[PDB]
mmCIF file of C-alpha atoms in Angstrom:
data_model
loop_
_atom_site.group_PDB
_atom_site.id
_atom_site.type_symbol
_atom_site.label_atom_id
_atom_site.label_comp_id
_atom_site.label_asym_id
_atom_site.label_seq_id
_atom_site.Cartn_x
_atom_site.Cartn_y
_atom_site.Cartn_z
ATOM 1 C CA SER A 1 -31.899 26.387 47.789
ATOM 2 C CA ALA A 2 -32.786 28.182 44.556
ATOM 3 C CA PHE A 3 -29.884 28.224 42.098
ATOM 4 C CA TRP A 4 -27.631 25.210 41.545
ATOM 5 C CA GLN A 5 -24.294 25.147 43.368
ATOM 6 C CA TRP A 6 -22.421 22.101 44.663
ATOM 7 C CA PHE A 7 -25.769 20.337 45.054
ATOM 8 C CA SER A 8 -27.595 23.109 46.913
ATOM 9 C CA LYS A 9 -31.109 23.708 45.589
ATOM 10 C CA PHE A 10 -31.081 20.006 44.715
ATOM 11 C CA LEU A 11 -28.258 18.945 42.395
ATOM 12 C CA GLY A 12 -25.812 21.140 40.506
ATOM 13 C CA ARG A 13 -22.948 19.859 38.369
#
């Protein structure tokens, strides 16, 4: 993924 969201693009708080 691109933006962060529930650990989408990689890892999003």
